[PDB]
Amino acid sequence: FLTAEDCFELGKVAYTEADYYHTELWMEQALRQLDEGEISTIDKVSVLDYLSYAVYQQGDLDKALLLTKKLLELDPEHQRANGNLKYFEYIMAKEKD
């Protein structure tokens, strides 16, 4: 049985490899396990940080934004997340044409 932390380690390495597809899959699995109440050294915000950017890297801005908003519900002061929100929004606005 792969734990939330196991999923996270796998996703983190995928991330560095820039394998965003597998980052999203592993990070998603981590999150679900967390959402279901798994007792883990890893936290939701950290999963969300990777997950949101991985989804972005694959071109789903809409979903990247939602995950970002989700992270910020949890950690409103999150620096990267706050930046990401404005960035994603900027690109989306410039996208609409």
Binding site: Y15, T16, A18, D49, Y53, Q57, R80, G83
Partner: peptide, 6 residues
């Protein structure tokens, strides 16, 4: 963060 825009 690794491949971040910043």
């Amino acid at each position: 963060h690794h491949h971040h825009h910043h």
